Amino acid sequence: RFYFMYMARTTFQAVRPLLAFSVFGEVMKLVLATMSSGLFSFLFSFVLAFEVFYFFLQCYISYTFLTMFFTVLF
Amino acid sequence: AVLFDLTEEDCYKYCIRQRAATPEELVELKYTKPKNLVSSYGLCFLGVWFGL
Amino acid sequence: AGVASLSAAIALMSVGGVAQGIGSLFAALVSGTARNPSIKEDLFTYTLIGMGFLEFLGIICVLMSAVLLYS
Amino acid sequence: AGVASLSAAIALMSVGGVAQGIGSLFAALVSGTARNPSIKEDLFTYTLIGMGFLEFLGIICVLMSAVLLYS
Amino acid sequence: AGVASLSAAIALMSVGGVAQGIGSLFAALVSGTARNPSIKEDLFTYTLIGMGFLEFLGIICVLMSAVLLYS
Amino acid sequence: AGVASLSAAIALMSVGGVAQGIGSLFAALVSGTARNPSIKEDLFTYTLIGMGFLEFLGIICVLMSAVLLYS
Amino acid sequence: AGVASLSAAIALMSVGGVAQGIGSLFAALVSGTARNPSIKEDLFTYTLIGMGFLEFLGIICVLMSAVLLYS
Amino acid sequence: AGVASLSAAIALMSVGGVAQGIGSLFAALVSGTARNPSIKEDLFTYTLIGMGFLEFLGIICVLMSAVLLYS
Amino acid sequence: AGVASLSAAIALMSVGGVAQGIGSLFAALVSGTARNPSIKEDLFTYTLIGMGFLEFLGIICVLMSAVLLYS
Amino acid sequence: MWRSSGVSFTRYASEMAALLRQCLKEPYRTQAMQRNQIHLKETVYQQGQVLTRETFNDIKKAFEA
Amino acid sequence: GFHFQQYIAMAGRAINPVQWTRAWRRMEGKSATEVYRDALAWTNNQFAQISRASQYRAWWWQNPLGMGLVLYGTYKAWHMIYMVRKQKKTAQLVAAAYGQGGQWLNPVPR
Numbered sequence: 001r002f003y004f005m006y007m008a009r010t011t012f013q014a015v016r017p018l019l020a021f022s023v024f025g026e027v028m029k030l031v032l033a034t035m036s037s038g039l040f041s042f043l044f045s046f047v048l049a050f051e052v053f054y055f056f057l058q059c060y061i062s063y064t065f066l067t068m069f070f071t072v073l074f
Numbered sequence: 075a076v077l078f079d080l081t082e083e084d085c086y087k088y089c090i091r092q093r094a095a096t097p098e099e100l101v102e103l104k105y106t107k108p109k110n111l112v113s114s115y116g117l118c119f120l121g122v123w124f125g126l
Numbered sequence: 127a128g129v130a131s132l133s134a135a136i137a138l139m140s141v142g143g144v145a146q147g148i149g150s151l152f153a154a155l156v157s158g159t160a161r162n163p164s165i166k167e168d169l170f171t172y173t174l175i176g177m178g179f180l181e182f183l184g185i186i187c188v189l190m191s192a193v194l195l196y197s
Numbered sequence: 198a199g200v201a202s203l204s205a206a207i208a209l210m211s212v213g214g215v216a217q218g219i220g221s222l223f224a225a226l227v228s229g230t231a232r233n234p235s236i237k238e239d240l241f242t243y244t245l246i247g248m249g250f251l252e253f254l255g256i257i258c259v260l261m262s263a264v265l266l267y268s
Numbered sequence: 269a270g271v272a273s274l275s276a277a278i279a280l281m282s283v284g285g286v287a288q289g290i291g292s293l294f295a296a297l298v299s300g301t302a303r304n305p306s307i308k309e310d311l312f313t314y315t316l317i318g319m320g321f322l323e324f325l326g327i328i329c330v331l332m333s334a335v336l337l338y339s
Numbered sequence: 340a341g342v343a344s345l346s347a348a349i350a351l352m353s354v355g356g357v358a359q360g361i362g363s364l365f366a367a368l369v370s371g372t373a374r375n376p377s378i379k380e381d382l383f384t385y386t387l388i389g390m391g392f393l394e395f396l397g398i399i400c401v402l403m404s405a406v407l408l409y410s
Numbered sequence: 411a412g413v414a415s416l417s418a419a420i421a422l423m424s425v426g427g428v429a430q431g432i433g434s435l436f437a438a439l440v441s442g443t444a445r446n447p448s449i450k451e452d453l454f455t456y457t458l459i460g461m462g463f464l465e466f467l468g469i470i471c472v473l474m475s476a477v478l479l480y481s
Numbered sequence: 482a483g484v485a486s487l488s489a490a491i492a493l494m495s496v497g498g499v500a501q502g503i504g505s506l507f508a509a510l511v512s513g514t515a516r517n518p519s520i521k522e523d524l525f526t527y528t529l530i531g532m533g534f535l536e537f538l539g540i541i542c543v544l545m546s547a548v549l550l551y552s
Numbered sequence: 553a554g555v556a557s558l559s560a561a562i563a564l565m566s567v568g569g570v571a572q573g574i575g576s577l578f579a580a581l582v583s584g585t586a587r588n589p590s591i592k593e594d595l596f597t598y599t600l601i602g603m604g605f606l607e608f609l610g611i612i613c614v615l616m617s618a619v620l621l622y623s
Numbered sequence: 624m625w626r627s628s629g630v631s632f633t634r635y636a637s638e639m640a641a642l643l644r645q646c647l648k649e650p651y652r653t654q655a656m657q658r659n660q661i662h663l664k665e666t667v668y669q670q671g672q673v674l675t676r677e678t679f680n681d682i683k684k685a686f687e688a
Numbered sequence: 689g690f691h692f693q694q695y696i697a698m699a700g701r702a703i704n705p706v707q708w709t710r711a712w713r714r715m716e717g718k719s720a721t722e723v724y725r726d727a728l729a730w731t732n733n734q735f736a737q738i739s740r741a742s743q744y745r746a747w748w749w750q751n752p753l754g755m756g757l758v759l760y761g762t763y764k765a766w767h768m769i770y771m772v773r774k775q776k777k778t779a780q781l782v783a784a785a786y787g788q789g790g791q792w793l794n795p796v797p798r
């Protein structure tokens with residue numbers, strides 16, 4: 001069972017950035033497709049920038065967990 | 075000012091006029107960070123969003 | 127207007143726990159700041175790291191709610 | 198027949214957790230201000246951040262309740 | 269259609285959580301005033317600030333309950 | 340009606356969140372008074388102010404339960 | 411295709427139950443950094459280990475939601 | 482047999498209390514490592530013992546769930 | 553025939569409280585140990601004594617569920 | 624705030640009592656800074672062979688050096 | 689042309705509601721003539737900076753057409769941001785009211 005647990009954890013830590021880049025991207029794409037005016041767009045630019053920072057955070061977290069999970073003593 | 079018994083204000087103004095006479099030479103100012111970057115980002119997004 | 131709406135509504139019950147966790151996070155940041163202000167940028171940093179999980183989880187729940195509202 | 202109303206009212210119920218989080222946050226703010234009254238702008242700023250997150254989630258859940266009601 | 273009562277009552281369930289948050293906030297006030305009885309004013313200020321949002325949430329919950337009731 | 344009775348009971352469920360808020364507020368008052376008896380009256384006034392908010396929400400919930408019960 | 415959706419929505423509760431616990435862990439990290447800023451590392455390691463555990467539980471519940479949602 | 486999927490979901494909801502427990506445990510561990518750091522070797526050991534129990538409980542909450550999803 | 557599985561799941565949906573209690577036990581153990589290491593043997597002795605009840609309760613919380621899965 | 628900054632409680636208490644004394648009224652403030660002037664002469668040794676000698680008349684420079 | 693970044697920053701401050709309260713407070717004991725003269729003086733200062741500094745200084749954007757290209761780019765930016773947006777809205781309006789090309793239809797034959 002430990003192998004299954006470990007592979008589950010590893011794959012989640014590997015796909016976390018892909019999710020942050022893809023599915024939240026699809027949500028932003030929906031909002032872009034639907035919005036027309038200028039006020040909402042002005043306010044939505046900051047959401048996009050927040051998504052940028054959030055993606056870099058998820059990438060840092062994944063780097064940390066992957067260097068933990070791929071570190072061997074010998 | 076101390077050498078001619080004048081006012082430091084007047085000497086400052088004279089120096090400034092004489093430096094402006096040769097304005098090709100850049101002058102050294104205190105560094106200040108940029109300002110209003112977030113608002114400028116929003117406006118530039120609005121710009122590209124409507125302009126492109 | 128059937129069972130999909132009910133499921134997508136029941137999916138939203140986790141947002142309460144997520145909000146409680148966020149409240150705990152930022153209350154700890156507030157207390158640490160009031161105690162030792164001179165490490166604000168550190169506490170804030172760790173808080174953001176925590177949000178990097180909590181926010182993500184909540185968004186997941188919201189997405190799965192919409193997925194069960196339009197499955 | 199009235200299942201959309203059921204779904205909306207069940208989705209609304211995260212306001213409880215949202216309000217619990219807000220109360221914990223502002224309680225931390227009040228305590229940290231009673232301790233360190235010379236530091237209120239940073240505490241208020243972090244409280245505003247947390248309140249923004251929590252109100253974002255609350256307006257999300259309210260919007261989803263309205264959606265399930267008037268789909 | 270008595271069914272639309274149920275939805276409203278369910279939405280009213282959130283009010284319990286809201287009250288919990290209010291309680292916690294006022295407890296933090298009643299403690300802070302004892303911890304630093306010199307001020308007693310900027311804490312009531314932050315109390316009112318938080319109670320604004322919590323009262324808003326309660327008001328919209330009540331309104332949505334009545335809406336799903338009558339419609 | 341059965342729907343009316345179920346809606347009333349569901350509304351009754353909200354009661355108890357108010358109880359937790361009331362208990363936290365009173366416990367805070369008891370501790371604050373014990374720690375600083377000098378401010379005993381001020382604590383009572385503050386608690387009374389909180390009491391109005393909790394009492395108003397609790398009665399409002401019972402009123403809604405009765406209204407749903409009798410349509 | 412409604413019972414599967416309701417089952418997954420009901421399984422999604424552990425996300426909210428886990429966000430509480432992640433909040434407490436990172437709150438403890440914040441308070442420990444406020445009480446001893448000389449030790450930033452040796453607190454984040456334990457924080458990340460416990461967070462990894464709770465993240466694994468989150469993975470479990472989300473996996474089982476998707477499982478019952480498509481099987 | 483959708484009720485199988487429901488039973489499983491219900492059997493998994495307890496993870497929300499489990500993870501909370503684990504969080505509290507590690508929170509206390511971090512606090513100890515922030516107060517008396519020179520005895521991490523003790524605190525971590527005790528924490529591992531607690532996890533050796535909690536882990537097991539969680540494994541049960543998975544296993545029984547899958548059993549009710551198949552049998 | 554899934555009603556038996558549903559009942560077993562419901563009866564198994566109380567181990568979360570046992571887990572929270574155990575977490576509080578070991579959190580207090582770790583805290584009081586960092587406060588006073590020399591008294592560990594008693595803090596542990598009582599922790600184990602508490603487990604001697606909590607684990608037993610959890611055992612019932614499993615056993616009866618298993619029984620309800622078949623009978 | 625002091626065990627983190629590498630500062631002692633006695634240093635903090637003295638350096639704050641100084642500011643409090645600065646927030647006094649002149650008739651009592653005169654007697655306060657009077658009774659709380661400073662004059663010391665530290666002399667550091669290392670198996671004989673004086674390493675340094677230095678005078679101190681201020682609290683902050685006394686705690687710093 | 690110069691100080692485009694400062695102009696963007698000015699617009700951002702103007703759109704900020706906190707600055708609206710700040711301007712409300714600054715408007716105490718103030719006249720419309722004073723405000724107009726201040727704005728005119730600011731614009732004159734900008735154009736005078738150009739007229740003076742172009743004699744001896746060259747910006748990063750200097751080119752064989754000089755400031756003509758910068759002014760053309762300002763115009764083109766304004767056009768694409770404002771006028772083409774208005775054209776889009778007018779197009780959708782006409783298409784909903786008459787159909788695409790409805791404003792150029794011939795008169796009804798008699």
Ligand SMILES: CCCCCCCCCCCCCCCCCC(=O)OC[C@H](COP(=O)([O-])OCC(O)COP(=O)([O-])OC[C@@H](COC(=O)CCCCCCCCCCCCCCCCC)OC(=O)CCCCCCCCCCCCCCCCC)OC(=O)CCCCCCCCCCCCCCCCC
Nearest residue numbers: 043044046047109110111112113700703704705706707709
């Ligand atoms: C008729 C129908 C239509 C009616 C409705 C019309 C719509 C109205 C909407 C209101 C907004 C209008 C547009 C302006 C937007 C703000 C733009 C801006 O200036 O920000 C630049 C701001 C400054 O950045 P910078 O220019 O680079 O640096 C300058 C320094 O910061 C220095 O800057 P500063 O010194 O000038 O100020 C700093 C300030 C910066 O904070 C801000 O960004 C300003 C935001 C305030 C918005 C208030 C709106 C008020 C109108 C609505 C009423 C709300 C009720 C509450 C009223 C106020 C009481 C609290 O604070 C801080 O930076 C942190 C310290 C906190 C200090 C305390 C600030 C609060 C002062 C007390 C309130 C004053 C009230 C003014 C009276 C208004 C009278 C009309 O930075 C930001 O961009 C902030 C983030 C952007 C905000 C949005 C965040 C993402 C969320 C988006 C929304 C979600 C998407 C949409 C979907 C939602 C569906 C519901």
Ligand SMILES: CCCCCCCCCCCCCCCCCC(=O)OC[C@H](COP(=O)([O-])OCC(O)COP(=O)([O-])OC[C@@H](COC(=O)CCCCCCCCCCCCCCCCC)OC(=O)CCCCCCCCCCCCCCCCC)OC(=O)CCCCCCCCCCCCCCCCC
Nearest residue numbers: 114115118122125126690691692693749758761762764765
């Ligand atoms: C997309 C372009 C087409 C626009 C839409 C179509 C319209 C066509 C009509 C074109 C008419 C142009 C208007 C002419 C009027 C004169 C304007 C002018 O000369 O001053 C401009 C103005 C500089 O004013 P300044 O008085 O000379 O003050 C200079 C400072 O002291 C700073 O001193 P410094 O020495 O440190 O730097 C001087 C200067 C040096 O500038 C340069 O020498 C050019 C930079 C590298 C050489 C190659 C340039 C071309 C390829 C790389 C750059 C791609 C962006 C294209 C920029 C167009 C201008 C070359 O630096 C800049 O101004 C930065 C410009 C590059 C911004 C890069 C932003 C990256 C985000 C965009 C994603 C990447 C591109 C996506 C693909 C787009 C393909 C079309 O630049 C600004 O926009 C201010 C930026 C303030 C920060 C705002 C927050 C960040 C947002 C960044 C976007 C900024 C808005 C522009 C959007 C472009 C990106 C989408």
Ligand SMILES: CCCCCCCCCCCCCCCCCC(=O)OC[C@H](COP(=O)([O-])OCC[N+](C)(C)C)OC(=O)CCCCCCCCCCCCCCCCC
Nearest residue numbers: 017018021056058059060061062063064065066067068070
């Ligand atoms: C132990 C090992 C640990 C391993 C850790 C692994 C975790 C990190 C994995 C993240 C990988 C994501 C990068 C690929 C996604 C971007 C695709 C792309 O480049 O688009 C074409 C880009 C965008 O071009 P464009 O958008 O202008 O136009 C063309 C776009 N296409 C072709 C897609 C239509 O090409 C570029 O011009 C890039 C130039 C800028 C540089 C971009 C790199 C910065 C952004 C990604 C950084 C991610 C790493 C973060 C590391 C943090 C660690 C501390």
Ligand SMILES: CCCCCCCCCCCCO[C@@H]1O[C@H](CO)[C@@H](O[C@H]2O[C@H](CO)[C@@H](O)[C@H](O)[C@H]2O)[C@H](O)[C@H]1O
Nearest residue numbers: 015018019022023024025026027030189193195196197
């Ligand atoms: C390998 C797994 C992990 C990697 C993650 C990569 C997945 C990223 C893909 C986008 C995720 C969401 O994708 C979004 O939801 C589904 C995906 O079919 C689509 O939805 C569409 O198909 C579904 C079928 O289930 C229909 O019920 C729905 O009515 C229809 O709109 C949306 O058009 C798409 O925008």
